[PDB]
Write a protein that binds this ligand. Structure first.
Ligand SMILES: CN1CC[C@H](N(Cc2ccccc2C(F)(F)F)c2ccc(C#N)c(Cl)c2)C1
Ligand SMILES: CN1CC[C@H](N(Cc2ccccc2C(F)(F)F)c2ccc(C#N)c(Cl)c2)C1
Lengths: 246, 251
């Protein structure tokens, strides 16, 4: 085998296809369908984390916290991948039954789609491999901690270092001390920049949630709890984002 | 007499007494306390709208700017006013929310939000310490209304800038009424404008609690009245996310 066993393991634990449940055209039905997709994505991330090496060994509260912190980040990062893989970055591939092209219009909603659109464009530009993406995804899950830190801070630190090492192996699959180091800068800078992007997504999400009755948008129960319980404190800056570059 | 005209005007358009409509004859619960506070908050908001219509300069900003400045400043103005009534009526040593909702420290302790009461209680203790005059308070309260703008600015940005600058000059005059000499009066300016800068930090804690309470309103049996609900829904997450521009007097 020439692909490292951890990257191989990560490949094997990747989620199956997730459908939004959409009727194959208003922003209420769209948001409702995006919310259903959100619920299914959250369930998928939680199940995925049960098989992710190192993660089940963290304190249970740390696990829950890290999944809640990174819910939106992992969704948008997965959106970037699918859009890149299936439509060359030129549509937003939320799910096989929810693909948004030459916009499906004019509002705040479609402005946030253009912000989300930056990530697929960046995957196309950088030509991210699946091996790189899988290691970057675990680092995204581990990319923010509480201000007081985690209960299992030592285990968390070791797990982060292991996957940073695995991203470097991932980068090594394709040559040269200066080019592989430049590419590490570029890939870890993309992760840094996601904090600023995801902040815009969290804000719109929480606003939309608190006026959901007025907008006629149904918010499923599991994702409502992450939104209700975490997004206010996150938006307020009551968490510590982790950066690779000062 | 000695009092400048605009300060006399500010005193004249100050609100009437406002009651929370709280039933003090039965024991505090967290839902009855927060529900009475929301009822008080609604009534204060209405009075801030009425007061703003009489505030020289304010009516001549774009209707959007006026709404936005009220929606940005409502919590700041409430706790500033709470601090002033507490200072004036009970020597700063109880929280005087309204004539029918007064919390001494034991009643604060027995509430579910003791830490938040102690955060609010800091303001009156500062008023006591500095011996803040009514003339300074009245100018400082207008500066709070005008103390955060959108990141992209206001529609009437020039007229806002000019309105704010006039009340800063008026605060400088209110200071001169008592503080004589360049040394004392400019230090006093530093102290009072530093107090207003610090409120940005204090209010950030109140906003987070307020927004959490709002989201959890049904589970907590805490009713949020109409106008208070729209100001929270309109701006509070944006404000908390730092997607507005707080104005500072000091770097
Ligand atoms: C209200 N929210 C909650 C979740 C849902 N959204 C987020 C979203 C979508 C479009 C535009 C704007 C946003 C914003 F709220 F985040 F800003 C969502 C759902 C599923 C996926 C996937 N896969 C993604 Cl990448 C997003 C809408
Ligand atoms: C949920 N909020 C919204 C409005 C009301 N609050 C704020 C409050 C009260 C107690 C403890 C904590 C807070 C906090 F939300 F700010 F934190 C309120 C209402 C009326 C007055 C007056 N006068 C005041 Cl000073 C506060 C309760």
């Amino acid at each position: 085998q020439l692909i490292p066993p951890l990257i191989n393991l990560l490949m094997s634990i990747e989620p199956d296809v997730i459908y939004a449940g959409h009727d194959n055209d208003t922003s209420s039905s769209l948001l409702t369908s995006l919310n259903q997709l959100g619920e299914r994505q959250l369930l998928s991330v939680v199940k995925w984390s049960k098989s992710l090496p190192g993660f089940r060994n963290l304190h249970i509260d740390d696990q829950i916290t890290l999944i809640q912190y990174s819910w939106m980040s992992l969704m948008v990062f997965g959106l970037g991948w699918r859009s890149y893989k299936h439509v060359s970055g030129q549509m937003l591939y939320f799910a096989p039954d929810l693909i948004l092209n030459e916009q499906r219009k004019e509002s705040s909603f479609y402005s946030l789609c253009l912000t989300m659109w930056q990530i697929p464009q960046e995957f196309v530009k950088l030509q991210v491999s699946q091996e790189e993406f899988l290691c970057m995804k675990v680092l995204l899950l581990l990319n923010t901690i509480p201000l007081e830190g985690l209960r299992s801070q030592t285990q968390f630190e070791e797990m982060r270092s292991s996957y940073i090492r695995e991203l470097i192996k991932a980068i090594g699959l394709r040559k040269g001390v200066v080019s592989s180091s430049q590419r590490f800068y570029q890939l870890t800078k993309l992760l840094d920049n996601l904090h600023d992007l995801v902040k815009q997504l969290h804000l719109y999400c929480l606003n939309t949630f608190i006026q959901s009755r007025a907008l006629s948008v149904e918010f499923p129960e599991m994702m409502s709890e992450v939104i209700a319980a975490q997004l206010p404190k996150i938006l307020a800056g009551m968490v510590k984002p982790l950066l690779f570059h000062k």
